[PDB]
Design a protein around this ligand. Structure first.
Ligand SMILES: [Ca+2]
Ligand SMILES: [Ca+2]
Length: 275
């Protein structure tokens, strides 16, 4: 009794699953609060922890990382939910603690680890109001090394005529993801700005939670993994594509929904992006 979350269907992933493209052999690093590797609906391939006080990357004391990982790769079996790319090798890069916050050094150290270990895709469902020379350098170095870097735009809403997109999503190298609901309308919390690239489902998203549980969360943090998962599906069909060709295909085959200041290029359609 396996349920497919609306969001997985909304970006058209099941169409690729049926063709045999499920993200096999693609390494996706979920840079977050850790992932509960004991979840029956997840298979964590590796990981590392950069939080000084939480040395086990496979222990998610928050719940954020496990939910985010489940959107990316919850297994295709007869239990729980289904992920966007269920055959992806999932890596837990724990940079946030039990309180859901982390220090930039920890996050940057996590991005660095991801580059060194050849992650194909990096998902950052995190972000702050300020950036740094070191934060830009890390995400720029990952993209130069062929990694697809996806990040949550932020949950700051609108503000006059200002961009409310956070970092690292604000850097040109990072694909910034905003959130939409089931009806393709922008979630009122979703950050806006000319830095927004794509939109993905982000309201009441059902996924995995520590302790063999399932729960729904809302935020651009939930939108982001739909796009990191999409990137993995596309690489399983076209492993020769560079990170640049993966991003172009994603941005260029979206379903146009309003002005780009609010919706980026629109809703991703991985069926059209995978070719
Ligand atoms: Ca499942
Ligand atoms: Ca960006």
């Amino acid at each position: 009794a396996q349920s497919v979350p609306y969001g997985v269907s909304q970006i058209k992933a099941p169409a690729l699953h049926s063709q045999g493209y499920t993200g096999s052999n693609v390494k996706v690093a979920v840079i977050d609060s850790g992932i509960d590797s004991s979840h029956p609906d997840l298979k964590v391939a590796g990981g590392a922890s950069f939080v000084p006080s939480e040395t086990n990357p496979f222990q998610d004391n928050n719940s954020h990382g496990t939910h985010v990982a489940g959107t990316v790769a919850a297994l295709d079996n007869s239990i729980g939910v289904l992920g966007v790319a269920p055959s992806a090798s999932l890596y837990a890069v724990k940079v946030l603690g039990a309180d859901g916050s982390g220090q930039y050094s920890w996050i940057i150290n996590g991005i660095e680890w991801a580059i060194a270990n050849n992650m194909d895709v990096i998902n950052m469902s995190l972000g702050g109001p300020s950036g740094s020379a070191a934060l830009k350098a890390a995400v720029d170095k990952a993209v130069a090394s062929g990694v697809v870097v996806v990040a949550a735009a932020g949950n700051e809403g609108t503000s006059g005529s200002s961009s409310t997109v956070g970092y690292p999503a604000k850097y040109p190298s990072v694909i910034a993801v905003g959130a939409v609901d089931s009806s393709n309308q922008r979630a009122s919390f979703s950050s806006v700005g000319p830095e927004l690239d794509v939109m993905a489902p982000g309201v009441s998203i059902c996924s995995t939670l520590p302790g063999n549980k399932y729960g729904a969360y809302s935020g651009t943090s939930m939108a982001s993994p739909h796009v990191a998962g999409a990137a993995a599906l596309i690489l399983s069909k076209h492993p020769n594509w560079t990170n640049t060709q993966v991003r172009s295909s994603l941005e260029n085959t979206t379903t146009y929904l309003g002005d780009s200041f609010y919706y980026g290029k629109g809703l991703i359609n991985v069926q059209a992006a995978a070719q």
